[model samples]
Target: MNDRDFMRYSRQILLDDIALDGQQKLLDSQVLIIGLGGLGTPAALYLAGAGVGTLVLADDDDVHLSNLQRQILFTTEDIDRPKSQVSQQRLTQLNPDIQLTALQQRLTGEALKDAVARADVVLDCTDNMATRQEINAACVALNTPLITASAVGFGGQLMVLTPPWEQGCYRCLWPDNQEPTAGVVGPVVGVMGTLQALEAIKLLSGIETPAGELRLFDGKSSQWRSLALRRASGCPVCGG
Candidate 1:
């Protein structure tokens, strides 16, 4: 790292756990974010600001007026614009040293697998259940680490899955493809997205990260709960 790079990340480099080696690891890592909505906004923001070398942002949706409530990356003027494109612009302004790729379409099949395979870490920030499962399956197949989260109503949930297939995958926890639609509080989703960023940084920097643990957040009561996860014997994705 040069003088300017050091100055840009001195605060993080000063950490005993991170130091120079960890910072370098972050600069050499690539992260693929699968959504640009409530969760993806904060996740992308922090990851970009933290100097992740490359960010692949994928989102097939356009910004709506409702997204401004919690999608921190966009402003009112950004309404109706594609989310991935807007996010790439915002993140580029945040850190020009990093490389950003914006894919403004839904990734499926081989496209999804290729994205996952290229990433050192994947953030499953999408909202729907089926997409989440698809992303999880690709991550497991590629042996890449994944950090997934969701927010609904006044609560949010987070999980970290890594290789070795011992702790199980996202599909093991929710076997059904049922999707739920509910009212989400703004900051609640932001909180979960921020956590996803934190986990990704930890994983890429070679810091110890929580795996096979489900963290539940209740914004109403301001409480967090964690549950240990186990591999489902019948899990189609990781079971074998």
Candidate 2:
């Protein structure tokens, strides 16, 4: 790394786990984040600040005044602007040295496959069940690592999945593919999103991260729980 690279990432480089080598890996990594809502916002900011080499931001939604509560990436002035554009501009301003790509539409079919195939890791930040499943299927098919999380009503869930599918895929955790109904609290979602970024950083930097474990967070009770995920006998996604 040049003088400026070291200067910008000196704190991270100081970590024994992420010395110069891990920082180099982070600088060479490509991460794809779908959804620019509560979960995607914080994750994007941390990844950009940490100097992920290339970040592909995908979302077709426009910024609404309501999003300012937890999205954190935009302000009142950004309302009405496309989220992908706003996020790109914000992330660029955060780290001018890194590369950024903004996909201003919902990724599906070939586009989804293409994005997942090109990424070193993928973050599923969307709030819908179908989109989450789609992202998981694509990630599994491409053998890419995925960090998916959700937050609603002062509660959050997170899971990290890598290739070889020993434990199970996201589909195994929720086979029904039904969306859950709950109100979203700002800090709850922010916590989950930040965790997603943390896990992605670990995966890219070659640090060990738990896979196939569903982490649940209850903000109201200040409690955390974990469940070991198992592969479904006839699950369509990862079951052969």
Candidate 3:
């Protein structure tokens, strides 16, 4: 690792948790971010800027005028362009040292599993409950830590799931079959996305203990709380 190559990352390295070694691990690691919308835009931008080495972005949505609220990865000129295409273009512009691979498709069962299996860390920027639950099950089954987030209208939520099925997985947290209305506004996503990026960096850099802790945030009330969620012993996703 080139120490001087990244003097920009000096502040992080100065910390005991993320000394040179941790920064090296981060630079050598690869991550998978599903959904390049609100949550992803911030997370991806930060991860790329933090020098995560390689990032795999999976999304099938195009740039929509409605997404301008918090999805800061594209411009109005990119309205007709694919998010995946535009993100790669913009991410490179943010930090050329980071490499990006954009996939213009959705991640179903096999596809999702394949993507998760290849990543060192994963983030769930997806909105739907079913998809979130399914993705949780896959990661819990494999003991993969995930940084997940959700946003609508003007509200948003996030959870970080780690191994041993201790801290609740998304399914263990939200065991429903239905989706909530589109969350709060675009800015809420921005809030959650910012948190999402911090958590991702925490996990990737191993700067903090993320084994089984969940952090919840409510932008509307300016409320932030942390909880340690336990795995439901009967949860099909994380249970035996």
Q: Determine which window of 10 residues in candidate 2 has minimal summed lDDT.
A: 174-183
Residue 186 displacement in candidate 3 (angstroms): 2.8
lDDT of 1 at 157: 97
Alpha carbon lDDT of residue 113, candidate 3? Answer: 88
Tens digits of per-residue lDDT, candidate 1, 195-238, equal 99999989999887668899999999999999999999999999
For residue 96, model 1's alpha carbon misses the true position, in angstroms, by: 0.5
**Candidate 3 structure quality by residue, lDDT tens digits, 138-195:** 7877677888887666556677777765666777777896754444576778778877
lDDT (0 to 1) per candidate: 0.92, 0.93, 0.80
State in Å the error of residue 229, model 1.
0.2
Candidate 1, residue 162: the lDDT equals 92
RMSD of each: 1.0, 1.0, 1.9
TM-score, every prediction: 0.98, 0.98, 0.91
Q: Once model 1 is optimally superposed onto the true structure by TM-score, how far is the C-alpha of residue 86 displaced, in angstroms?
A: 0.6
Question: In model 1, which regions exceed 4 Å deviation?
Answer: none
